[model samples]
Target chain A: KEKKRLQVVISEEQDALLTRAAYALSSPERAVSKSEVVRLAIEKIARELEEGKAKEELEALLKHL
Target chain B: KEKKRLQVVISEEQDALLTRAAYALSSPERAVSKSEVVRLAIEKIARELEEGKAKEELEALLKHLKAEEGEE
Candidate 1:
């Protein structure tokens, strides 16, 4: 599969959280990359959005943005 | 990293969820494959498990698996 590079800005807090999550999933035999963590998060969010589970929550949170 | 092929069974409903997820993430410029969707799900679950939030849930699931194994 071909991969494309993507760049986005995130807060220090968000970065810390992602780094922690990535580290937790990494092992001596298999190291998890930061890109893998972000891609996983994106797919999860997109799935939730398609399932209608996140619609209300997203709308409610959108007001704060 | 080298990749290995894995095969697993899932319900039709589960397959639909994965298909929809892939569609939601795909664009004309970039297409998301079913394998990509599964990989994402795996990483997400692994992250959740490591965070301790899924500990109790996983325990219950494993308990069920053990029960099924005994029945088999």
Candidate 2:
């Protein structure tokens, strides 16, 4: 955890929106915590940045998609 | 699906073994499909290989990791 750090924190309103969007993509039967979603988003973005691959490659493969 | 198709497939024996391991991590109430396990395994492995991060980063944070407070 010490090796990587967050660059910035989102405002409460934006955080709520981002959290909801992330949850909608995954399981919706339970509440999705902001920290969990933010962690996923950051890790995924960092992965794409490091790999130089299309960011869309990191998108979750939805059952419906 | 045509946009990003897989290039190879695993043998039945390897497929079954992989499926069993993958199912152990998720809900075990239902039988998991070989395709499901293979897809997730491939996706996660490819992601880690491409990103070059600690392999543990791709692991699912199972609730069981916490102290046992209730039924398993």
Candidate 3:
């Protein structure tokens, strides 16, 4: 899939916090950027991927049937 | 780690929109709920456990490195 960038302005404090969070996730060679953080966030937000909806239906369908 | 839940109170319209989006991704038998939707959203927001930056250093190092150097 093609990657897209998301740009937004934030306070210096927020920027620092974001950078720290990203860095925590990154290796020394690759400091995390806000864009990568946001993209990962969106993928998780989508929540339609495998292992995502595996629980409730498995239990309920068994009970119903 | 134990599974966690993240509760969110969204607008009815927003909820419907999210549900539809989730349903499109889900099987007919497994329509996603608001709670599940929010849980996944929180998982994304954390970002610590997810794949993060590896490209910058790769590009930086490669930019200086010779590609296809010294005839095969």
Candidate 4:
């Protein structure tokens, strides 16, 4: 499959959070990247929204933000 | 934030696609897991659907798939 490049700008605080999540989730054999962390987070939120629990999920996520 | 584990079953084809996507999108310094690849794909698809563009996106996707199939 052909892939397209995407460039996005994020805040330093968000970058820090990504780094922290990557470190916490990574292992010697398998390391996680900031992009991967964001992807995982997006997927989780999207899934919840799809399941008709958008309100509840968004509230839970907002608490952290 | 608290984290929870999720277990899902996928077909071999789906797994292969996930693996391929992860490798393609990942960098040498920062490798992406299959789980992350799947998550990204879902997020992208879900976002389009949520924005009320599901029909348009799905139709375009189907057309692309058909074109690819024809090429093969």
Docking class of 2: incorrect
lDDT, candidate 1, at B40 = 47
Please, what are the lDDT tens digits per residue for candidate 2 over residues A1-65?
Answer: 11222233223444445444444434544343444444433344334445655434423531312
Which ranking of candidates, highest lDDT first? 1, 4, 3, 2
**Models sorted by DockQ, best on top:** 3, 1, 4, 2
Q: What is the DockQ of each candidate?
A: 0.06, 0.03, 0.13, 0.04
Model 4: colliding residue pairs: none
Per-residue lDDT over B1-72 for candidate 1, one digit per residue giving the tens place of the 0 to 100 score? 233334343334445666677686567976766656555445454546566875554444434433432324
lDDT of 4 at B6: 39
Q: Which stretches of candidate 1 lie over 4 Å from their true place?
A: A1-65, B58-72
Model 1, position B53, has a per-residue lDDT of 73
Candidate 4 wrong stretches, greater than 4 Å: A1-65, B56-72
Which predicted model would earn the best DockQ? 3
Q: What is the C-alpha lDDT of each candidate?
A: 0.51, 0.38, 0.41, 0.46
Clashing pairs in 2: none
Q: Candidate 3 — which pairs collide?
A: none
Residue-level lDDT tens digits of model 2 in B1-72:
112222232233333454454454346565544444444333443444346563344333312221221332
Candidate 3, residues A20-57: lDDT per residue as tens digits? 54665567664545544433433434443433553453
Cα deviation of B13, candidate 3, in Å:
23
Question: Which candidate comes out best when scored by lDDT?
Answer: 1
